[PDB]
Amino acid sequence: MIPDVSQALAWLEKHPQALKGIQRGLERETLRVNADGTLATTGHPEALGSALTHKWITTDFAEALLEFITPVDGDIEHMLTFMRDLHRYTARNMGDERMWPLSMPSYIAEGQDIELAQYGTSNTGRFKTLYREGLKNRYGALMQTISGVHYNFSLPMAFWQAKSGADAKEKISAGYFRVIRNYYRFGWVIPYLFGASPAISSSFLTSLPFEKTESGMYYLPYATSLRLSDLGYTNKSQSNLGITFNDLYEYVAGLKQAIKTPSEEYAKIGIEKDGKRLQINSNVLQIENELYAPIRPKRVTRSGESPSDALLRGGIEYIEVRSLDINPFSPIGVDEQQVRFLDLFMVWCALADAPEMSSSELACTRVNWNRVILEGRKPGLTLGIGCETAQFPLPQVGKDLFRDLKRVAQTLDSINGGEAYQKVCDELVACFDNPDLTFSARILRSMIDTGIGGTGKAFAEAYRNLLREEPLEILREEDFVAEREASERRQQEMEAADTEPFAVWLEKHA
């Protein structure tokens, strides 16, 4: 089932310097909670300054939902250390609150009570909140509290150079679409290794054969990542809207068409209700982020550009992988082993040939993802090519892919010096013979002993105590203070610069 990539591997083995200079960035989300596991209802902590403008620390959907963002970086340890400093500083400046360490929250009784991220009174800040109001009304606040890690990745120019004019940005875009098509066909290996959400609170809910406990914890005995299942998110699958990844313009046209298509469903919600604005507009997507997407091509926008404008202007700059659950075994929710595996997998995805796929061939790649998501750890599980009958045992497919990943590891290890990528392959490949080594088996044992609540409360306490004692390593305290002051100032400035009232301004971005 794994295709044959000997030509591309051989090519890579003869050009190791083509991989020198990979760039990465991490985003990690986590709810602020009290010791009892419930969402804090305090505001974004003072010491973090303005969530709207801050460089490293912001909020996602909810006021209690923190997001840490590392600046693009070529060194894995440097980037993880940076991430850990954000966590350390935050952990000691949020009063008695702490950070929820799983993707799935514990029982929440009233989704409707959750405060949306608040961004002040400037037009940009309100738009951002109104966007969330919109999401709240379309899909419910509850699902937005489920969190994850994004891993952002780009190959160096050297890679493309070893593989002229206006073609360059086109070859690069084509190669990233290749990576994306391959992620669709094979990326189920990610939730298999690192899925960490085999259980969900009944407060968040089916034909599924759930085991139940009296506190409302539901779980599937072999699942890997319910975060990625239909129960773990509410919005429209890019796959489902019929967006494809064969060609850049086509992709952008599909995306932009969704921004402009009105929706009968969302019009029923209404745009206003008692002088309170309820969504930005009533289109399928309010803005491009509303598209649910396990993986997404990107380019950093310039001032005023929409994300898709940037793509059209400059082609794909880098890939965002969104399918990683929070790593509950790391205080920062992600570790070196995961980052190195994604390096190897993404690189492999860029090498393997990937035929174009129509909407329904893409839909078929999801059959395997669903098997792995809901019962990836089942003894005897078999996978198939697209929709064809399942017939390849999962472990053997894993070992096949790792035969290749190991060759890429050898190449990366020889340029970085050391053995770090090879060790990672050996550690991970073992998970195909023993599914009990995977994150989701480990975290299910924990959740059976103490619940989602008990497991999250206990890690959150333990992690709070590491994080708040550890010395800052790269950022120092005065950097947090400086960035607090500067972020607050940029917010005062946007507030003062507005000249039109929100209603008028809105009528030109709605």
Ligand X SMILES: Nc1ncnc2c1ncn2[C@@H]1O[C@H](COP(=O)(O)OP(=O)(O)O)[C@@H](O)[C@H]1O
Note the residues at the interface with Mg ion (CB under 5 A): 27, 60, 67, 150, 434, 436
Instruction: Kindly list the distances between the CA atom of residue 39 and the CA atoms of 328, 428, 444, 467, in Å, as whole numbers in the listed order.
Output: 18, 34, 23, 19
Nearer to a second copy, 69 or 364 (CB): 364
Only segment of 21-29, 44-52, 68-76, 430-438 that touches a second copy (CB under 8 A): 430-438
Say whether residue 150 binds ligand X (CB under 6 A). yes
From candidates 244, 281, 286, 338, binder to a second copy by CB under 8 A: 281
- Among positions 177-236, residues that touch a second copy (CB under 8 A) are 214, 221, 229-230
Site string for ligand X, 320-349 (x = CB under 6 A): x-----------------------------
Radius of gyration in angstroms for the set of CA atoms belonging to the chain, rounded to a whole number = 22
Which of 53, 106, 123, 446 forms a contact with a second copy (CB under 8 A)? 446
Nearest residue (CB) to ligand X, 209 versus 304: 304
Interface residues for a second copy in 373-392 (CB under 8 A)? 374, 379-380, 382, 385, 387-392
Interacting residue with a second copy among 305, 320, 479, 495 (CB under 8 A): 305
> Which CB, 144 or 327, lies closer to a second copy?
327
User: Other C-beta atoms within 10 Å of 160: how many?
Assistant: 15
Q: Cβ neighbours of residue 352 under 8 Å, at least 6 residues apart?
A: 3, 5, 8, 178, 182
Task: Decide: 159 and 255 in contact? Cβ < 8 Å.
Answer: no
26 versus 196: smaller Cβ distance to ligand X: 26
407 binds, among Mg ion, a second copy, ligand X, none (CB under 5 to 8 A by kind): none
User: 313 to 332, contacts with a second copy by CB under 8 A?
Assistant: 313, 329-330
* Of 3-11, 103-111, 246-254, 314-322: span binding ligand X (CB under 6 A): 314-322
The smaller minimum CB distance to ligand X, of residues 130 and 444, is found at 130
Residue 190 CB, shortest distance to Mg ion, in Å, is: 15
**One-character DSSP codes across 91-111:** HTSSTT-EE--SSS----S-G
275 near ligand X (CB under 6 A): no
- 71 secondary structure, DSSP code: P
Amino acid at 421: Y
54 Cβ contact partners less than 8 Å away, ≥ 6 residues apart:
48, 483, 484, 487
Q: Is 318 in the site for ligand X (CB under 6 A)?
A: yes
Choose one: 63-71, 144-152, 344-352, 447-455; the region binding a second copy (CB under 8 A).
447-455
CA distances from 123 to 279, 370, 439, 498 (A): 15, 41, 43, 7
The nearest distance, CB 268 to ligand X, in angstroms, is: 27
- Residue of 185, 63, 165, 75 whose CA lies nearest to 114: 63
Closest to a second copy by CB, 10 vs 168, is: 168
Say how far apart CA 210 and CA 199 lie, in whole Å. 9
Provide the b/e sequence for 102-117 (b: ≥16 CB within 10 Å). Answer: bbbbbbbeebeebbbb
Per CB under 6 A, 71 contacts ligand X: yes
Site map (CB under 6 A) of ligand X, residues 279-308, x = contact:
---------------------x--------
The yes or no reply on residue 168 touching ligand X (CB under 6 A) is no
Please tell me whether residue 152 binds ligand X under the rule CB under 6 A.
yes
Of the candidate spans 67-75, 130-138, 184-192, 360-368, the one that interacts with a second copy by CB under 8 A turns out to be 360-368
- Residues 6 or more apart whose CB falls under 8 angstroms from that of 104 comprise 146, 197, 199, 200, 201, 204, 226, 227, 452
Exposure letters 38-73 (e unless 16+ CB within 10 A, then b): bbbebebbeebbbbbbbebbbbbbbbbbbbbbbeeb
- Separation CA 371–CA 208 (nearest Å): 13
For residues 20 to 39, the per-residue mask of contacts with ligand X, x marking binding by CB under 6 A and - elsewhere, is: ---xxxxx------------
Cβ burial, residue 247 (10 Å; 0-12/13-18/19+): middle
Residues that bind ligand X (CB under 6 A): 23-27, 69-72, 150, 152-154, 300, 317-318, 320
